[PDB]
Amino acid sequence: NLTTRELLAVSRASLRELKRRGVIRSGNAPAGDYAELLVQRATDGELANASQKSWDIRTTEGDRLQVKARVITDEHANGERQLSTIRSWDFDAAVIVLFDDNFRVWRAARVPAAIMKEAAYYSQHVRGYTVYAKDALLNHSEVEDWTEQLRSVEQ
Amino acid sequence: NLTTRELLAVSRASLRELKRRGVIRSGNAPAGDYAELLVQRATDGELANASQKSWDIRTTEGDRLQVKARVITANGERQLSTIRSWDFDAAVIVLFDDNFRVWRAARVPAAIMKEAAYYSQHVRGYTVYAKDALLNHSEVEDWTEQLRSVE
Ligand SMILES: [Ca+2]
Ligand SMILES: [Ca+2]
């Protein structure tokens, strides 16, 4: 095993190259970048440009998808189901991708924008909305389980 | 350099380890997590709970610290993330080089941060550039060697 410092530089350099080759967009958010790749492969959707802030992937049938992803360490850690801030509701559905400790897909779900809003909380500190990816959201009857589909593409 | 598939496995394995060691939390902010670890270790401070958004680390003497970090590879790289709360005692600025060794680090009182920030209307917050002029004096403390020590 190597030092923490080297590991960061190992990860940042690999991501930097993957980013120049056009497979990913940013190098700044590994879990989100991975989930984008995975949702792009599972749908053959097109990536947004970096400038498109309301959504990340557009399916060929039209759907605009905001991809939110996070690494989970313990399915029972309720505070770890917290997703990064949403600052625009101008999309058709979100895709929530929860990774385990291996950065393999633990659960993934397609949530209509309406159900996301219903679950969100506004925050003035961040100028956005906070959503917790609780089981009750993940198993909501208008949510699609995308777990095995994203495991079929890598991770 | 290598094949795309190997880079994915190279990045995924490195992240796997960083995450096992507790160095990474959500996976979206590697550099930020590390800078926090370094400032938490260079002090004996406590990490903020989920609800406390105004600061990141509380020192044993009380001080609440908002940590802002960037990898330095050019004024556009000195740009820090948006501040939307002034409810903290000082900011700790951590500039890494590409190897993630600490290149410059500085403890800036809230007053000097405010003095150096400018409000931005489209983002509804304040932006601070970690220029040398801030890093040197203005009554800010050099924390560079201190953060390199806990490395
Ligand atoms: Ca996203
Ligand atoms: Ca921070």
Author numbering:
A (entry chain A): 15 to 169
B (entry chain B): 15 to 87, 91 to 168
Paper text:
The BisI family of restriction endonucleases is unique in requiring multiple methylated or hydroxymethylated cytosine residues within a short recognition sequence (GCNGC), and in cleaving directly within this sequence, rather than at a distance. We present the crystal structures of NhoI and Eco15I_Ntd (N-terminal catalytic domain of Eco15I) in the absence of DNA and in specific complexes with fully methylated GCNGC containing dsDNA. Both proteins are homodimeric, with each domain involved in target sequence recognition and catalysis.
Crystals grown in the absence of DNA contained either an NhoI dimer, or two Eco15I_Ntd dimers in the asymmetric unit. In the NhoI crystal structure without DNA, the dimer adopts a more open conformation overall, primarily due to a different main chain conformation immediately downstream of the dimerization helix α0.
